[PDB]
RNA sequence: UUUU
């Protein structure tokens, strides 16, 4: 039993997707410690209007002022589960809403959305049903682990530059000014917890958020949030076209799911400076490929993700937090399923299970 | 589950 991923099978009308609502938030601090508040949220602070153009040095501080998260620590859903536990009797939707929902990280859903168009990287998703609720947690594929261990030095510095860009664009207090002199600590994260629904599948998911724009006319989250991105500067119309067809699809998927309405991109030259900023409204991204024979279609993304959720819901019949259905996908094939019990795939921790039982 |  498998699930095909070809875009032609999902070419129908755009499916129902509920306007996402923010249910709460949590922060992870410099020590990767959880706090149920917004202490890690930063505030959009672009270059002053009368000053010179941006000239952000994205390599400044590498690697002396870089404190990277330890990628061997596999946190899975743990931080989101703690939020849920601390809010289980305050969830909107009425009684038993959680029992009919699917719970995951925003980034897991992003990978589903782009699957009909992805040709390089596959994925694996572990699924467990517990008290009706379906939990989806990404598993690092063996190939992606090897790629991570063999990360080239230049790719490591480019990873730093994406985080450094945010430091040039965000301040710790509204109206404040950025401080690039500090350290880039990728243990720090602000996460928004959202409710949505795709087709008939209710969703509870969390996603890291880069910053809140206090200058935005709308200030009810998530509409006051801004997503920050970098990309290489482009000259040729063929370069812009390739950007529209590949990078923009992943920017759209990531920001559409939580309802983040703007992506602000910093374009960097070969020497590692950002000398151009451009805002991309999420709801206009598809306009750049709407009439492109090699473009992407948001309806294909969303219809496939709805089909996968229905495929997952029907495949995971047993309610058991120790049982895992592992969904595996590689480009050129369908999504396949295998069944596993206990370690290493089981991911719901006993401190969650036992508290939810009682 | 952030980055490229
Ligand atoms: O991008 C692709 C390419 C192929 N397949 C699927 O891989 C199988 C053999 O080619 C087919 O699925 P079947 O066993 O149900 O017939 C094909 O649809 C996909 O799902 N996505
Ligand atoms: Ca970002």
Numbering used by the authors: 27 to 384
Give the text the authors published on this PDB structure.
In eukaryotes, the DXO/Rai1 family of enzymes removes numerous 5′-end RNA modifications, thereby regulating RNA turnover. Mouse DXO catalyzes the elimination of incomplete 5′-end caps (including pyrophosphate) and the non-canonical NAD+ cap on mRNAs, and possesses distributive 5′-3′ exoribonuclease activity toward 5′-monophosphate (5′-PO4) RNA. Six conserved sequence motifs (I–VI) form the active site which is located within a deep pocket, and several residues in these motifs bind divalent cations for catalysis. Here, we demonstrate that DXO also catalyzes the hydrolysis of RNAs bearing a 5′-hydroxyl group (5′-OH RNA).
To understand the molecular basis for the catalytic activity of DXO toward 5′-OH RNA, we determined the crystal structure of wild-type mouse DXO in complex with a 5′-OH hexa-nucleotide non-hydrolyzable RNA substrate mimic, OH-U(S)6. DXO crystals were soaked with OH-U(S)6 RNA and with calcium as the divalent cation to further block hydrolysis. We observed good electron density for four nucleotides of the OH-U(S)6 RNA and a calcium ion in the complex with DXO. There is electron density for a calcium ion bound to the active site residues (Asp236, Glu253 and Glu192), and this density is not observed in crystals not soaked with calcium. However, the calcium ion contacts the phosphorothioate group between the second and third nucleotides of this RNA instead of between the first and second as was observed with pU(S)6 (15). This suggests that the scissile phosphate of this 5′-OH RNA is located between its second and third nucleotides, and more importantly, it predicts that DXO generates a 5′-OH dinucleotide as the first product of the hydrolysis. The U0 base has π stacking interactions with the mostly conserved Trp131 side chain, and it also makes three hydrogen-bonding contacts: to the backbone carbonyl of Arg102 and the side chain of His105 directly and to the backbone amide of His105 through a water molecule. The 5′-OH moiety itself is intimately packed against the base of U(S)1. The presence of a phosphate here would make it impossible to adopt this conformation, which may account for why 5′-PO4 RNA cannot bind in this manner. In addition, the U(S)1 base is in the syn configuration in OH-U(S)6 RNA, while it is anti in pU(S)6.
